[PDB]
Amino acid sequence: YPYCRLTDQPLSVDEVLAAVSGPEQGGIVIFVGNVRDTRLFYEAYPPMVIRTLMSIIGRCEDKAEGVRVAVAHRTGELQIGDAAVVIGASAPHRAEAFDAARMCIELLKQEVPIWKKEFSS
Amino acid sequence: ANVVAEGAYPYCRLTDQPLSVDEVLAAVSGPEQGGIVIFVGNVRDHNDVTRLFYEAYPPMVIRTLMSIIGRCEDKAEGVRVAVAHRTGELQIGDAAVVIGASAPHRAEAFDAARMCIELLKQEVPIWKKEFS
Ligand SMILES: [Ca+2]
Numbered sequence: 001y002p003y004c005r006l007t008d009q010p011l012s013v014d015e016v017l018a019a020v021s022g023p024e025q026g027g028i029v030i031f032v033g034n035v036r037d038t039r040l041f042y043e044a045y046p047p048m049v050i051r052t053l054m055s056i057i058g059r060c061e062d063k064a065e066g067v068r069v070a071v072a073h074r075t076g077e078l079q080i081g082d083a084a085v086v087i088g089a090s091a092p093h094r095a096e097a098f099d100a101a102r103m104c105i106e107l108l109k110q111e112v113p114i115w116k117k118e119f120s121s
Numbered sequence: 122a123n124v125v126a127e128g129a130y131p132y133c134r135l136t137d138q139p140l141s142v143d144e145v146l147a148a149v150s151g152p153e154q155g156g157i158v159i160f161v162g163n164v165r166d167h168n169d170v171t172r173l174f175y176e177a178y179p180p181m182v183i184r185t186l187m188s189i190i191g192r193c194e195d196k197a198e199g200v201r202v203a204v205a206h207r208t209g210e211l212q213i214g215d216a217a218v219v220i221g222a223s224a225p226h227r228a229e230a231f232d233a234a235r236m237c238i239e240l241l242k243q244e245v246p247i248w249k250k251e252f253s
Contacts, residue, residue, distance in 0.1 A: 013143070017161075023165060023166055023214060026165040027160070028163065029158065029159070029160055030158070030160075030161070032159070033155065034154060035155075036152065037153055080152055081150070081152070092165065094160065098231070098234075098235055105227060
């Protein structure tokens, strides 16, 4: 199965990178979505979100041969500098890894149902 | 062997040692960088060892990389690009290049990363041979 995580813990670039690596993957694209410049919370129902993430991964891998996609999304409280999402896509060639990573994040942004809360301490 | 531009310098590293995603990632991170894209170009197999060298003097290659970075950064506001490049003897699976690009938003980060690798491949001349 693909690497597909929804967690309250800091995301791992190492893990996403490893999930997507392999002898035949010449190109790897990794997207990191960081929190920019006050408290921030992500609230989600994990079963629904994870299912949605799996759907997205399947559609992205479907575009070209040898394409591997991994996704990690964070929930809970976040700080400036924290990764909210980490996406990895690999392919024999760089074009297909760029295509899959970009497709993955656009779909995620459009589809993953999430509540965003902002208040001030 | 390692040469790296640190501080205010744009991140540029030439080495014969294993590359690091984390270092490149840190190099383009910032309070206002909301979207970050990393490209890793790996040695893959076509039926086990690859030797890679510059066709030019390393300082010439650095000038080239620094110029490429400048141009990629000039395309939009808040764009940061970083390049790590490895030569010598590499294994199947080894990273030959790690590129990082960041920006306030994701679109410019993807643009910068893609532009960077494209300019690199057409402007940085590399001696490449496969061995057994
Ligand atoms: Ca050549």
